[PDB]
Each structure stands twice: as C-alpha cells, then as structure tokens.
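Subgroup meeting minutes
Present: P.N., E.W., G.H.
Scribe: E.W.

1. P.N. recapped why we're keeping a running log of single-chain structure predictions: easier to compare across weeks, and new members can see raw inputs and outputs side by side.
2. G.H. added today's entry (279 aa).
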Amino acid sequence: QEYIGIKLELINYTTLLEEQREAEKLNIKLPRFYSNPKNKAIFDQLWENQVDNAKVYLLAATLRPETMVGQTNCWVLPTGRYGAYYINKDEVIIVSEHAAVNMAHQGLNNNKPFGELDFISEISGSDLLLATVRAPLSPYEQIFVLPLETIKMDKGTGIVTSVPSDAPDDYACYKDILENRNGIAEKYGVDVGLMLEPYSPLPIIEIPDIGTLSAVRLCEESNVDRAKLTQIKEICYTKGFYTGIMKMGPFAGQSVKDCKQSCRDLLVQNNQCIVYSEP
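Output recorded in log:
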C-alpha cells in the first residue's frame, strides 16, 4: 500500500508581509494583521542552519485523499522528535526520522546517495504545536497544528490530518480540545476561540441513511469510548467508501469510490502531495 503524504505548508508570515505591499481609520475596530510566533521561531532556526529562502511543509500521511477538503487542523505528537530535511532544491519537509529513512530507500532525497538523508536541523513537537499551515483543498485559508497524544512515531510521518466530519477519532480529540476536557486545552496553551471555533467540521461527504457530518452524528447520538469509536470508524470508513457522495470540493456530486483515485491525481498536479511506500 502507498501512503499519500499531504504537503501542509508552514505559512511564512515574513514573505506575506513583504508581498502585502505589492477601514479602521474610521473608529471601527478589527484584528491587526495576524502573525504566528511558532512559525517565526521555526524559520529563525532554519535560517541559522543556512536554509536561505525555501518552502517548508509538514508532511502528513493519509490513505483518504478524498477527505482532504474537510481538514480543520492537523496533529503532531507534543513530545515527538521531528527533523527538517531537503527533498529537492528550495523545498523542505518536516517529518519523523522513520518517514525520512523510508523515503530515502525510494530516492526522494535532494540528489543524495541511496538511503542517505539531507538533514538540516531537528524540530520538536513543542516547536510545531499551535503553528499555522496552508492545507491543500481545504476552504480554510489556514489551520492550526494541534496536539494528539496517541500519535505513533513508528507509523507514517508522525503528522496526521484532521477531518472531524468523517473520522471519529479526529472528532473526539477535536471536541476534547474545544471544551477543554480535563484541562487539556490549557495544558498545551491552546487559544480555543482562535484555533478551533472558526474551523468547524465540514459536510464533505453524505452517507445515505446517515447524512453529512457522519462521524459527528454517530458520535453525538451515541453520547461519546474506544470500543464505540472503533465501531463508528468502521461504519464511517466502510459506508463512506461504498455509498459516500462528495458534497464539497471539485468533485462535488461524484461518489467516494469513483473520485478517490481522482483526488489523488489532482493533489499530484497541484504538487500538494508526495506519494511513497512502507513495509
């Protein structure tokens, strides 16, 4: 099985500010130009490792490219150790070492010999947490990197996509953060009103006999934990594939089975993903 690695672009607020130059002056208050300090610190560190000016992407493995228009956020292990690498010129990805190794055994380095890495610097989960990325296919102009304590640095890239409308586990954690369950939002310094409230789950797929926010509907009507979660994930992933109909995105009106391969190809044409494989 091939993994689709979604290129989540770490937003460069410096570039944007040196491009936003090519109301309020009437006593009507609105947000000052937003800037994310976690993004800046990652860049400052990359600078002090001679990266010049390059595009930087968190890479998040997914087996479900059709759900990509429903991203509300993404997940990193708060204690995870990630690394910054070159894949080619002018382009840097942040992944687990496990992923970078498995990516070197299929020649995806910056012209380096087989199996060797193009290491730049180490990035901790702490540094990544509460950063903002540009998520491909999502209507959201940016999303936040959020904490998932159950991420395994030995599977995928250590970064996971979040589609709460159609992944029960995604929704459970998302909802846990939103309502500060057991103080979990405070523990990681999450500004809930800025980082979650504007990014509600999206009606991307309609499953006949259930509806559009299936993971949400089933989760809320079963009042949600792990055994019920595996059960709903079974319905969502199975019924989703066989009966699911896209309601959002460029393939709206098409079924999930038919446009699954199609969303893959669009991601590659957009250069918004990296396709790889693992044992």
